[PDB]
């Protein structure tokens, strides 16, 4: 609506392959489409130590 800003409505941010990110009364969590599990934290599992 403003120029197509880069945040407007569109979808999450950028999570993993099989994540959603739902925005309920509660908050804003994530809806593993996967297992169909709910969460609430950022799931970004990167070890590059080990």
Same mark, same amino acid.
């Given at each position: ?25 509660? =908050? @804003?969590?994530? #809806?593993?489409? %996967?297992? =169909? @599990?709910?969460? #609430?934290?950022? %799931? ?7």
């Amino acid at each position: 609506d403003s120029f197509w800003n880069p945040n407007a409505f569109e979808t999450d941010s950028d999570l993993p392959a099989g994540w959603m990110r739902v925005q309920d009364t509660s =908050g @804003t969590y994530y #809806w593993h489409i %996967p297992t =169909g @599990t709910t969460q #609430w934290e950022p %799931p970004g599992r990167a070890s590059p130590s080990q």
